[PDB]
Amino acid sequence: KLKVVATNSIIADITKNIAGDKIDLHSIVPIGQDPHEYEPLPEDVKKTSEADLIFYNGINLETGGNAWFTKLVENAKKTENKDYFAVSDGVDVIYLEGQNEKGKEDPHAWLNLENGIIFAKNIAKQLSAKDPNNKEFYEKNLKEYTDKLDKLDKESKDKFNKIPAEKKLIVTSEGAFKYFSKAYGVPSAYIWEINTEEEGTPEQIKTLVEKLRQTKVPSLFVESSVDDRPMKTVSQDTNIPIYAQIFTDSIAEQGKEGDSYYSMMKYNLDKIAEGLAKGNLYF
């Protein structure tokens, strides 16, 4: 079997849907954990060295202090675009908004299903190149998976139209919803823009608190892969409840709701619409 390493559970799940049992797949970043800053275990180091194919996010996910993925593949002596591939190649990138983050990409492409499709295309392409005997199989799985993703994408374009302007704002800890906001027509706000920066300072919380206390936003959200303390402080200081845990940088654990890329997205879309519609009744 082809030996394949994926950096996080989101890329791993998409690869599973394309490759099934035809490969030997390993995922580095454990479920629920931050993929921005991770220190690979010796078993991850060993799997990476022996891999014929490595998939990572690219666009500024696994690169920061101090570029853990770069260190891993360099030490394992793997070549970019021969041994390891960014699944984000081709995505319409959104950049970070911060004053000093000039030219720096926002990595969270997958929260737009259109990019999920691109991820899958990239994976299928690379698997096929390395494992021609299974090309037809990979391509068929790609066709089915992308149609499933596409139909959910097309259905969800108007999912937030019903939310009045005053209530219409996604609030999470990390500013991980830029692509989601653009794909499904709903603004987002945050405590900190990206995980590599300081995560939940008094000043950040205060900044978001004063923004919120002059909105009618009915619900806050927290991500499965961050410490919830900052958002809980935001909750107390604004009197806006946290409605639900949502998924950004990881899928859910097996057996939980959202334990794949597709159900993660379905769940996010569902739960976010619920929280912003909170209080709505027929009679």
Author numbering: 32 to 314
Please give me the paper's original passages concerning this structure.
The PsaA–Cd2+ complex revealed that Cd2+ was coordinated by the metal-binding site residues His67, His139, Glu205 and Asp280 in a structure that was highly similar (root-mean-square deviation (RMSD)<0.3 Å over 242 Cα atoms) to our previously reported Mn2+- and Zn2+-bound structures. Nevertheless, small re-orientations of the side chains of the metal-coordinating residues allowed the bulkier Cd2+ ion (ionic radius of 95 pm for Cd2+ versus 84 pm for Mn2+) to be accommodated into the protein–metal-binding site. In the PsaA–Cd2+ structure, the distances between metal-coordinating atoms and the metal ion were increased by ~0.2 Å compared with those for PsaA-Zn2+. Accordingly, the coordination geometry in the PsaA–Cd2+ structure is an intermediate between a square-pyramid and trigonal-bipyramid (n=5), in contrast to the 4- and 6-coordinate sites observed for the Zn2+- and Mn2+-bound PsaA structures, respectively. We then assessed the distortion of the linking helix by monitoring the number of disrupted backbone hydrogen bonds in its flexible region (residues 184–194) in wild-type PsaA–Cd2+. However, the larger ionic radius and ‘strained’ coordination of the Cd2+ ion at the metal-binding site, similar to Mn2+, resulted in an easily destabilized metal–protein complex, such that PsaA was incapable of preventing release of Cd2+ ions into the permease. In PsaA, the regulatory mechanisms that have evolved to prevent mistranslocation of Zn2+ ions are not capable of preventing the translocation of Cd2+ ions.
The pneumococcus acquires Mn2+ via the PsaBCA permease, which comprises the ATP-binding cassette (ABC) transporter, PsaBC, and a cell-surface solute-binding protein (SBP), PsaA. Similar to other ABC permeases, the SBP PsaA defines the specificity of the uptake pathway. However, our recent studies showed that the functional specificity of the Psa permease in Mn2+ acquisition arose not from the specificity of Mn2+ binding by PsaA, but instead resulted from the concerted action of protein metal ion coordination chemistry and structural rearrangements that prevented release of other divalent transition metal ions, such as Zn2+, into the permease, despite their ability to bind to PsaA8. PsaA uses a ‘spring-hammer’-like mechanism for metal ion binding, in which the dynamics of the metal ion-loaded protein are dictated by a combination of metal ion geometry and the distortion of a helix linking the N- and C-terminal lobes of the protein.
